[PDB]
């Protein structure tokens, strides 16, 4: 993540997806056997090549022998044609200690008020000479799409299935290696995954918000896949 800071400790819903042994993508653990993530995360079709590490803080697991959980991937369920969502089934549930937790999800129709504060999380690119490998977090506020369209200056027009968050006046935000990661907000009381990181039109461009995928738009579908 460009222009964010190290997370104090590790984060429960955070999943690193690994293709052919190196990390490639983020993922939100939404139920014991399901990681919600982006489609741009699967170069292979052969699920042998992948592996999902859970309850880590160091992208390479360096701090975290006492928390790490590595799981093979058993299923890929791609979401509707429009979306870049895909639901990953892991071959055996994650076991939920304090280091591994699921994130909540929105109700199907729900909105979010503007300037609702949020975070993106990731082990993707930080433009640093030597990234120490720890999870990074960048804070954004939710922008409306209507303004978000005008900030991107006519280049993009957002579907009711896309959602925006930016930081005021500066460049920060997710990037290569961050995708599939959660944009997480909170309002009601607790924490919900509200957008899913997908590739942008440039990382941390000063004063141009990030567009994420509205999970709310897809919650029905997600539930009918994960609830069982």
């Amino acid at each position: 993540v460009v222009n964010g800071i190290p997370t104090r400790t590790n984060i429960g819903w955070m999943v690193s997806l690994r293709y052919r042994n190196k990390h490639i993508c983020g993922g939100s653990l939404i139920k014991e056997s399901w990681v919600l993530t982006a489609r741009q995360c699967f170069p292979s079709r052969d699920l042998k090549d992948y592996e999902a590490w859970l309850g880590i803080h160091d992208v390479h697991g360096r701090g975290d022998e006492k928390c790490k959980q590595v799981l093979n991937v058993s299923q890929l369920v791609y979401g509707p044609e429009g979306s870049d969502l895909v639901l990953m089934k892991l071959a055996r549930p994650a076991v939920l200690d304090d280091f591994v937790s699921t994130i909540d999800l929105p109700n199907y129709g729900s909105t979010i008020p503007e300037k609702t504060s949020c975070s993106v999380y990731g082990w993707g690119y930080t433009g640093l000479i030597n990234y120490d490998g720890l999870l990074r977090v960048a804070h954004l506020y939710i922008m409306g799409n209507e303004k978000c369209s005008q900030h991107h200056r006519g280049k993009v027009t957002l579907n009711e299935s896309e959602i925006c968050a930016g930081a005021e006046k500066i460049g920060s935000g997710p990037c290569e290696g961050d995708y599939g990661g959660p944009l997480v907000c909170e309002q009601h009381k607790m924490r919900m995954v509200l957008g899913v990181i997908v590739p942008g039109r440039g990382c941390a461009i000063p004063n141009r918000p990030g567009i994420f995928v509205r999970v709310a738009y897809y919650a029905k579908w997600i539930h009918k896949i994960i609830l069982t």
Partner: protein, 499 residues
Amino acid sequence: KYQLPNFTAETPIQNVILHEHHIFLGATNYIYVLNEEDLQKVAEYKTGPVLEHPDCFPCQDCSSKANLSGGVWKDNINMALVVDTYYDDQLISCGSVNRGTCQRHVFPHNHTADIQSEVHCIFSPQIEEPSQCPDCVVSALGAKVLSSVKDRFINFFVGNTINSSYFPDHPLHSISVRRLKETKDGFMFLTDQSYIDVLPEFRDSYPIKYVHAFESNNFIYFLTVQRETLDAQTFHTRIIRFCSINSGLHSYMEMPLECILTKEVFNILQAAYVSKPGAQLARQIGASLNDDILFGVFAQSKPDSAEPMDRSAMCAFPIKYVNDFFNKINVRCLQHFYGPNHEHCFNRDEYRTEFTTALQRVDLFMGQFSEVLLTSISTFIKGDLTIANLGTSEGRFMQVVVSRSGPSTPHVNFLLDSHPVSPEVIVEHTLNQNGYTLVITGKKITKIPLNGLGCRHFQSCSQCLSAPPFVQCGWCHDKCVRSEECLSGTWTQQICLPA
């Protein structure tokens, strides 16, 4: 002798792009910027002569070795030129020279002729698999590059003629698909299935010219000239088709194409444009007002060779039928990529299929052009009519009507600069069905209007009223032209006053 918007550069023009009312020529050692409106040069950028060296690496430059122990000074032929607009608007250009290594010119947020102020070379150093070189895009000895946005990534599909200059750690690939990084500082190949390469053994035997590429209907297509079979004497044009995906080249198949006189075959494709048909042509060839057709200007081989004789014929393939021929239920295996022997080939995403028979179609000109070498084609609709824009090795440019029923003769025919006509061409429409073609000749680009022209050569009222009706000329007091292009309140197709 016509009088047209006439820009001349100091070096030969390889390639041409029209973007936001400017024209970008990709030239030997140069990129130019002309104004769309009058073709005046607004800006240059010097990709200028460059120095080759074993020690001098591909994105770092050197007058820090100019004195040379075994290093040569080299001409920087433009091989590719892509405007990208998904990211912040940028010109991406790919030269022949530093192992085929593209740079991006980023337009400032108002001056569009500014190829100059912010330019980054694109070569990220290779660390996971130090064997690969995904920033080595283009081949000095023939490339076609087609870029398209897909899955929020900019994707580059790339045909490259390849010659067994075993380059340690910077090889090239015959076809391949790689995406940019959102960090804009490097291309990446998604998996090892994302390129298909001529086998090291045949890398010389003989090669694969890439004439044209285009995306349509969710496949990528390449047009190609190569080896009816390996070490097999005679040459040949194929289509190559594969699924439009980042993840790799998927449903790959090359199928031969045949143009014939009516068998008198034109086995060397020279140029090609892809467009929709007009009703007249539509009706005739299998139709669909809104269908993509591949117009291909072909040529006859000098026996046992790949070089073309001065014999031409053009003929048109609707891609809808191309697909049928690809899909329907026979099929060989990719002799130049697999062995002729070993598994997969003795068997039947995964497999790579050659076809044993061509899709043939007949000359649409019926030999009208069987004594000249057509080197460039382009196509447009006027009402019901479909019109070819043709170009020739002798320098002749000419507008013809395309038809089976009717052996039509060109209504425009004349000399552009003595240097041959280039297959690289631009057509751009404007409201109400006119527009222009940009046409490269040696080192000159000319802005030939699609429409008014076939009138301008009538030197007298009478003669003008006598022109072929479809061209729709009239007499405007002293000149001959179509109504929109006529100044005063007079204009006829019927009356000549006592002059």
